[PDB]
Write a protein that binds this ligand. Sequence first.
Ligand code: HEM
Ligand SMILES: O=C(O[C@H](Cn1ccnc1)c1ccc(F)cc1)c1cccc(C(F)(F)F)c1
Ligand SMILES: [Ca+2]
Ligand SMILES: [Ca+2]
Length: 451
Amino acid sequence: KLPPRVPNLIPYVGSFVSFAKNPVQFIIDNSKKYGDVFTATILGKEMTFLNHPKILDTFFKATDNELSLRDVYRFMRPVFGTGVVYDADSTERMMEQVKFVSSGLTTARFRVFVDIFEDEIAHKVKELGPEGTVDVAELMADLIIFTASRCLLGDEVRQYLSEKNLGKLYHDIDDGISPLSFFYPSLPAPKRDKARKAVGEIFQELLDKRREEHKKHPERLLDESKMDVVDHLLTQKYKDGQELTDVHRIGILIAGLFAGQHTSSITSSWTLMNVISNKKVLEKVRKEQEEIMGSDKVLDYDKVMKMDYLEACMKEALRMYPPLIMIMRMARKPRECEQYIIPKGNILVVSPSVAGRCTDTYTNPDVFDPERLTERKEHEKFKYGAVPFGAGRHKCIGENFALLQVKSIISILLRYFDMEYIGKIPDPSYTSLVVGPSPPTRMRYKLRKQQ
Ligand code: HEM
Ligand SMILES: O=C(O[C@H](Cn1ccnc1)c1ccc(F)cc1)c1cccc(C(F)(F)F)c1
Ligand SMILES: [Ca+2]
Ligand SMILES: [Ca+2]
């Protein structure tokens, strides 16, 4: 009736050691032994892993008082803020907060975002010069610090990045966020907290400055192309009529930036590496770019919307290396799954990493092959065969922005540079909450138009 159990190495600690070594491998290996659904004790928590696409409907379609996100992701509170997101008072409030971020991700904004990407890359090529080598992961992270910040927060953020070290503060917050916090939400992190307080004061200042810029220039509020998330946060209230606190606005912006940065810079790195290392894929990608660009010299939104093959490359990098390797929920009530009952209080776990390598969905899954998606449609074999952006009620609302961001960056970089990857494509490093490539990730580059 209860699922089969991974027997423990030890009491309490349970299966932590082999989970911690490689959680993707742990789920695959134990799926073989115990099947589609099994339970492991891990640092005191009962974690029930759901391991096949076919059984996932009841996970994704549940409501929040059956499968709770707030119960598992509340540990983010020292980063995102008290009363924000997974520490909101209710599901309903969290959902309204999400809608404030999504309201800055409009079509009108997306046309302006493409210019932001052009402008930031143009600054960055001054650092890279006409040739050299660079770490792919760092390049992407550094570009996306600037692009995400300006997209979500407005161009007024830029001078804080260039003159007040805001990008270093982001790294200190991000250095302090540990997967083990999920198990111990009180692990102190004094450096993290100091930087979070510092980011708070900067964003408070930015909110204050914007209120006076709204007084002095009220027509800004009538221009859908100039309205960002800070603007919406300052001018909207909750449905029931309660106004937002500056605490909340700050927390929401910080969570917005967290979501707008990590997953995108990781996916860009894996996408670009696999594109430049595969001659056939690079040819197709460049032939699509040349066809879409024609005689124009800069991107725009409509162009990025036609870049289908490159989008398939990004999707194929998301199958193979999803930056969010595990999706969780707590069972607030018992749950049926196949023939089993999953107890109240268990954590249900679905893994986009395991799904992406499932040989029942994908043929030769260790190979990067975007045609598996465009021509073989392998993803469409199960409803939940591809879940890098999740599914159902909590499906990623940043998806179109992330597509826009990564396609644009890669398109622009391929315009400026020939690029070759150094060495073998690395494995994922399971050292961080958002999972990325094991360093080093270096490439050579050379400008295509020298003078
Ligand atoms: C390639 C980039 C990205 C990936 C792979 C990604 C992945 C995911 C996944 C897997 C989920 C489902 C989580 C769950 O069910 O618990 C999700 C939800 C979400 N993502 Fe993303 N995301 C990306 C970019 C973004 C961006 C750029 C934003 C916002 C600017 C964003 C905002 C969200 C939000 C708000 C949710 C909803 C979570 C909830 O309802 O509790 N994401 N994303
Ligand atoms: O950053 C967020 O979630 C990340 C996962 N993620 C990134 C991109 N798409 C989803 C997250 C979720 C749970 C957790 F424990 C740590 C980080 C996030 C989630 C809900 C709402 C928001 C928002 F809208 F910014 F307030 C951000
Ligand atoms: Ca173990
Ligand atoms: Ca799974």
